[PDB]
Amino acid sequence: PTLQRDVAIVGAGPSGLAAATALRKAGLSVAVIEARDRVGGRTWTDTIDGAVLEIGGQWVSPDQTALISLLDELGLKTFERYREGESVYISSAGERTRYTGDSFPTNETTKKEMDRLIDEMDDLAAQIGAEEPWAHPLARDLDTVSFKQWLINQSDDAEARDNIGLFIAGGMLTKPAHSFSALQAVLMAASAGSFSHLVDEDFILDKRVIGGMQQVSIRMAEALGDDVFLNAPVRTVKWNESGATVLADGDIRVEASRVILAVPPNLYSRISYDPPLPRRQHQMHQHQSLGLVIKVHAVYETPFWREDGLSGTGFGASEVVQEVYDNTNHEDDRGTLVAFVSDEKADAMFELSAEERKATILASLARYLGPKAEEPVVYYESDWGSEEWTRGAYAASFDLGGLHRYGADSRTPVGPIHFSCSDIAAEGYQHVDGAVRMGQRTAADIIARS
Amino acid sequence: PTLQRDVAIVGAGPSGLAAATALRKAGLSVAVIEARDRVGGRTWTDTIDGAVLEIGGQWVSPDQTALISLLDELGLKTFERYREGESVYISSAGERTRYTGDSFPTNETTKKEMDRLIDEMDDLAAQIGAEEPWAHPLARDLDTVSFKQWLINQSDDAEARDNIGLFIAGGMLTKPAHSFSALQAVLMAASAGSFSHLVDEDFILDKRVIGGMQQVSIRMAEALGDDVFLNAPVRTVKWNESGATVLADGDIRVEASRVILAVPPNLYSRISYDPPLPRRQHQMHQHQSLGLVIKVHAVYETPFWREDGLSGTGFGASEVVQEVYDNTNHEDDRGTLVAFVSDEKADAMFELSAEERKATILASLARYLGPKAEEPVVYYESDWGSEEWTRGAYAASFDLGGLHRYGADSRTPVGPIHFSCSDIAAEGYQHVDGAVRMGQRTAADIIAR
């Protein structure tokens, strides 16, 4: 079929759907064209071996105000993650200690080093900000030193530097600390409101949506009706100063005034542009890449850790699994754990056989919470790296030096072509809240233009 | 058209063509499918305002034995870049000094610092090698420190550091030194035979091809006749354990036992694979990127610098133009300069208007060679970044950390899909010679079974 719209939107993830919804609200007509047999992108709720799981993005923090309004507008409610009782910390030397409150139970030197670093990171984030971190006069020096090297320049305490890295490198950017810059650590902190917010799992991992995060996309898409096309990878964008024509599988053709690429940046060159994008985009898009993380799901007869006085939360920068949390579904009698295996530790697990990998990850949940972690009734690993329409998790970031070099260009339109995804967001960078903000910002930009 | 072939080859650059050439000798049949209206890829000879220029790759060094051997087989000869008389050095203090001989005319202390850093890089390259630098016991620590931070650790002398950087960062990888690892520097050095080989423009930039480097591809492609398809971007590869179908524009459909992707790695995902490549390829390919450099060409009625006793060679790590060389065509009476503006300096020139960029570049050329450099008869800038089928220059390298993490996987086949370009080569990495070696290494693999 051939259609005529004011805006063609490539990608029916939360970012494209939020842009579509805002455009519709303002009276513009839209078509959203999606590759997969479903909407939601990196958010997805599925049933595996009888257990309902969130395969992707799921948590809402209190600074995610754009996602919180959108939830309210769609009739969706939240619930809080279980946090009663003791958390577990595993030290660099391998000592396992139960604790409550909000510092790790390390020796005092380490604790004071961590506090000081948290404070320095909060300070940098408040000064530099998430809107245009590259523009600050401190930015050049921060963007040309790796986060690993910057931590070495700040502190002699190995354990403190490893735990600070746990929160940014394994915990957010899903890349090793030697491979992105101090500035990129600052941006990640600023985007979430402060580094202290990313440190406190009670803040950044506070709530979930009743019915799952994918419902945010599913409900936006339901309201768009026949203007959403599924099973339709977009292959070609033909453009000029006044116009873009978008071509997709199934003989789909959309003639639009503007196009929104609502896809992560590592995937822009999956589409052919006629004429080609300018040199600056050709170069910039090469320097953007997704991290890699395994999101592990483990379902048990009950949340057994709660009988032992444990919250289910566990941190260990030297473990294969660096984080574990209670991920029990709203009103479920069965318990579910969630755990994360990050970057180079993920590659290492994927090189083991499926059997050996499972055994290694369950051994590690057992190190945190006890030998009952070893007996789930359902076990599943989210595998976003294999998915050709994602190719990693959670989200994309520049290589080292790319944030200062290309950051000012990452949202600029090219003629009628706009860009919108969480991976180029300011507040809410990498999160559904960022996807939502960017979709709304791109919509408002198009509306003013037209 | 639909055709059957033993091997379908995507890309008619030197790597694809060298592979097709080797495959035919064994009696395997081939189709070589090429996006552009020409062969050669990053090699290309063109005529701008009536003056002939090598828009891309052009120089041959004595360690480039796969290339040299191929030139002989194709009946092509070489000539040497003019090098008589004095070179020019521009110091960090902006001081300009004519010199000859094998080191920069700096003070003795800076000279000792440079020498020590060159010996250190030679030693690392000799221990580590180009074949699998990631497997060496020193590899992890070299690959997690940037080259800039490694230089800072080795030497406190900023002029000596910037000068070593000139040869590797602006001069090869065309990325700034804070963005790639020490191990990647060591690779670049091992791949050319040593770091000293890259410091000596009389080695790395020794010879050119009579008739132009593009002739290497042109001749190879001529011998293949109707098995080369031009103006045919490949869009899809459908594959299983025993075979592939390759689909290109113009309704080309090639059914084959093996496919070679003879394209730089930042372009692999311009193609759809059915079923998708595995996760490890999905990830690795995102971590590969081309550098950026403006190859500047300036043509004058004579090689005027030779009249002032200058070789045409100039170096200055702080200039916008960090290098200038005599690039006079074989038996032309007109003189031609070649010059390079690398990485973030290229981004900054591209941000000015064309007129202001040209004046800024020619001002810098004038500082090396005199006010005559500012009145060329023909001026041209190679723009590979704008080409959708290249998108940068000279070649691709990992981001920081990628070489150790992914290196061992960069040549591995996926089922019947093989990978062959200069950007994944061992010896000859990033150069025509590496493209030839990889093309021949891939063909030998497929041939042997």
Ligand SMILES: Cc1cc2nc3c(=O)[nH]c(=O)nc-3n(C[C@H](O)[C@H](O)[C@H](O)COP(=O)(O)OP(=O)(O)OC[C@H]3O[C@@H](n4cnc5c(N)ncnc54)[C@H](O)[C@@H]3O)c2cc1C
């Ligand atoms: C395991 C995991 C855990 C995460 N944790 C959370 C968390 O707890 N909280 C949170 O808020 N965020 C989290 N995130 C991140 C969050 O899911 C993403 O930031 C957000 O989904 C990004 O949305 P987007 O619309 O910007 O891109 P995406 O959701 O990736 O959507 C892009 C869409 O475009 C489609 N597409 C791509 N190319 C084409 C093409 N050529 N043609 C047609 N369609 C195309 C894709 O199929 C996809 O549907 C997590 C993600 C993962 C994977």
Ligand SMILES: Cc1cc2nc3c(=O)[nH]c(=O)nc-3n(C[C@H](O)[C@H](O)[C@H](O)COP(=O)(O)OP(=O)(O)OC[C@H]3O[C@@H](n4cnc5c(N)ncnc54)[C@H](O)[C@@H]3O)c2cc1C
């Ligand atoms: C400014 C510049 C200066 C250089 N300096 C030197 C030097 O002097 N000496 C030296 O040895 N090397 C030099 N190089 C590097 C050298 O030219 C490259 O190493 C070499 O050409 C690599 O050859 P290749 O076959 O691996 O890839 P390429 O030459 O890039 O060829 C790949 C081919 O694939 C085609 N292609 C890509 N995608 C598709 C697709 N989907 N479908 C069909 N076709 C496709 C492209 O059009 C291209 O023709 C220079 C390069 C440049 C750009």
